[PDB]
């Protein structure tokens, strides 16, 4: 579900607006179903307003007068917190088409005219929310980004992969994107990389390796050739690599009592996935020498403030099943709360001492 922030002065009548908007509920048998957007949750916002706006996907600023110290203040807050918004002129039965043009046009945001008492204009909110809601459109995995025509890309997988005659999706995607850019894609097992580099006669533009063959291959790849991992490529692809890389530095500042949350992007994690639940916590404890308060969070939606509040670092999974939107919604939430958020991929690369090299072609 999407989280809508409801902002306005005490006099504007937020209660009447929220009740009239709930009258738009379109469910078949303050949360509700509002078309064309799916399920939504209205957040009433009664000095860090950061504690309420932390998981807001978009906001509504309800006005009935000329922009003042309140309007200017919450607009600056929406901009700072990366929250899209629109202005809803309430009580149009008293002031009407006065503030629509003469003011508020300068904010370059949608302006709607409503009357909660007269029951007018609430059938236009759903479409307006849908238009401002952050759609986190797919960004290239390695294509338009790091490739060009005639370049050699070396994709280095492990000695063991997926079922007979098949390949894992990050490998297929990396090959497809390379061919899309008309680059030559050289797929090679870790044992053939040294031979390939030394005899291929074309300088590789990029070498992409599996995170489990990285420590071996870093040695085989000359320093002048760009090298990354599929874990780092995934990190950038669906998350925020810059934030994940900056947030991993928090590992150094971890104290004994400090809370670390292993955050999962799904409720269907395989029992064979012990990298975040078992492996990373043990590596973190050995590296820091801190008896950390390791906690695990797993769900499809957004955590409540109480579940994440005093976390010193969030270590989110790769997000194999998650889209960019859902991953970015979590990133913006931790950015708003100023809580460091990293990846399994960024943590692995950091502790192995290959992060600086792996991010060099991307940053």
Residue 253 tokens read as 């500042």
* 58 annotated as a binding-site residue: no
Distance in Å from the first CA to the final CA of the chain: 33
Q: Does 319 bind ligand SF4 (CB under 6 A)?
A: yes
**Contact partner at residue 319 from ligand SF4, a copy of itself, none, CB < 5 to 8 Å by partner kind:** ligand SF4
Number of helical (H) and strand (E) elements in the chain, helices listed first: 16, 14
Instruction: Return the SS3 of 144.
Output: helix
Residue 10 neighbours by CB under 8 Å, 6+ apart: none
- Kindly give the pairing relationship between strand 39-44 and strand 2-8: parallel
Binds a copy of itself (CB under 8 A): choice among 196, 294, 305, 321 = 196
Binding segment for ligand SF4 (CB under 6 A), chosen from 129-137, 183-191, 211-219, 312-320, is 312-320
Instruction: Return the SS3 of 17.
Output: helix
Q: Does 65 bind ligand SF4 (CB under 6 A)?
A: no
Site string for a copy of itself, 153-192 (x = CB under 8 A): ----x---x--xxxx-x--xx-xxxxx--xxxxxxxx-xx
- Cα torsion at 272, 275, 277, 279 (round to 10°)? 120
Radius of gyration of the chain, Cα coordinates, nearest whole angstrom: 25
Identify residues 228-287 at the interface with ligand SF4 (CB under 6 A).
264-266, 269, 273
Across 139-162, b (16+ Cβ under 10 Å) vs e yields eebbbebbbeeebbbbbbbeeeee
Distances 54 to 83, 260, 280 between C-alpha atoms, Å: 10, 19, 27
Binding segment for a copy of itself (CB under 8 A), chosen from 96-104, 198-206, 217-225, 255-263, is 198-206
**Contact partner at residue 321 from ligand SF4, a copy of itself, none, CB < 5 to 8 Å by partner kind:** ligand SF4
Instruction: Return the SS3 of 185.
Output: strand
How far is the C-alpha of 245 from the C-alpha of 242, rounded, in Å?
Answer: 5
Q: Does 137 bind a copy of itself (CB under 8 A)?
A: no
Q: Does 317 bind ligand SF4 (CB under 6 A)?
A: yes
Q: Does 172 bind ligand SF4 (CB under 6 A)?
A: no
Binds ligand SF4 (CB under 6 A): choice among 129, 251, 308, 322 = 322
Identity of the residue, 176 or 295, whose beta carbon is nearer to a copy of itself in the bound complex: 176
Identity of the residue, 38 or 165, whose beta carbon is nearer to a copy of itself in the bound complex: 165
How far is the C-alpha of 53 from the C-alpha of 45, rounded, in Å?
Answer: 8
* 71 annotated as a binding-site residue: no
Output the smallest distance, CB 269 to a copy of itself, in A.
23
User: Contact residues for ligand SF4 (CB under 6 A)?
Assistant: 264-266, 269, 273, 317-322
Q: Residues marked as binding for [4Fe-4S] cluster? A: 266, 273, 317, 320
User: Contact residues for a copy of itself (CB under 8 A)?
Assistant: 141, 149-150, 157, 161, 164-167, 169, 172-173, 175-179, 182-189, 191-192, 195-196, 199-202
């Amino acid at each position: 579900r999407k989280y809508i922030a409801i902002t306005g002065r005490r006099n504007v009548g937020k209660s009447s607006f929220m009740n009239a908007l709930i009258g738009q509920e379109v469910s078949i048998v303050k949360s509700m179903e509002l078309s064309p957007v799916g399920p939504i949750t209205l957040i009433d916002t009664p000095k860090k307003a950061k504690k309420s706006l932390y998981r807001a996907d978009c906001g509504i600023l309800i006005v009935d007068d000329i922009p003042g110290n309140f309007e200017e203040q919450i607009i600056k807050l929406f901009k700072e917190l990366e929250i899209p918004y629109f202005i809803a002129i309430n009580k149009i039965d008293t002031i009407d088409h006065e503030n629509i043009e003469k003011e508020y046009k300068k904010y370059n945001v949608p302006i709607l005219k409503v009357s909660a008492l007269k029951k007018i204009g609430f059938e236009k909110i759903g479409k307006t929310i849908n238009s401002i809601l952050p759609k986190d459109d797919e960004i290239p995995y390695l294509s338009d980004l790091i490739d060009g025509g005639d370049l050699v890309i070396l994709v280095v997988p492990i000695d063991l992969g997926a079922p007979k005659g098949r390949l894992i999706m990050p490998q297929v995607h990396a090959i497809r994107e390379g061919l899309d850019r008309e680059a030559l894609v050289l797929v090679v097992k870790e044992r053939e990389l040294r031979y390939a580099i030394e005899n291929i006669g074309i300088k590789p533009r990029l070498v992409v390796t599996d995170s489990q063959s990285v420590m071996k291959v870093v040695s085989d790849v000359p320093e002048d050739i760009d090298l990354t991992t599929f874990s780092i490529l995934e990190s950038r692809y669906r998350g925020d690599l810059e934030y994940f890389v900056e947030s991993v530095k928090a590992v150094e500042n971890l104290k004994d009592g400090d809370t670390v949350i292993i955050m999962e992007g799904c409720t269907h994690r395989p029992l064979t996935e012990d990298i975040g639940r078992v492996k990373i916590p043990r590596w973190l404890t050995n590296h820091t020498g801190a008896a950390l308060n390791l906690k695990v969070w797993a769900g499809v939606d957004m955590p409540e403030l109480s579940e994440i509040e005093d976390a010193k670092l969030i270590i989110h999974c790769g997000g194999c099943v998650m889209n960019r939107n859902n991953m970015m919604r979590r990133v913006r939430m931790f950015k708003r709360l100023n809580i460091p958020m990293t990846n399994y991929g960024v943590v692995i690369s950091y502790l192995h001492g290959v992060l600086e090299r792996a991010i060099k072609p991307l940053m």
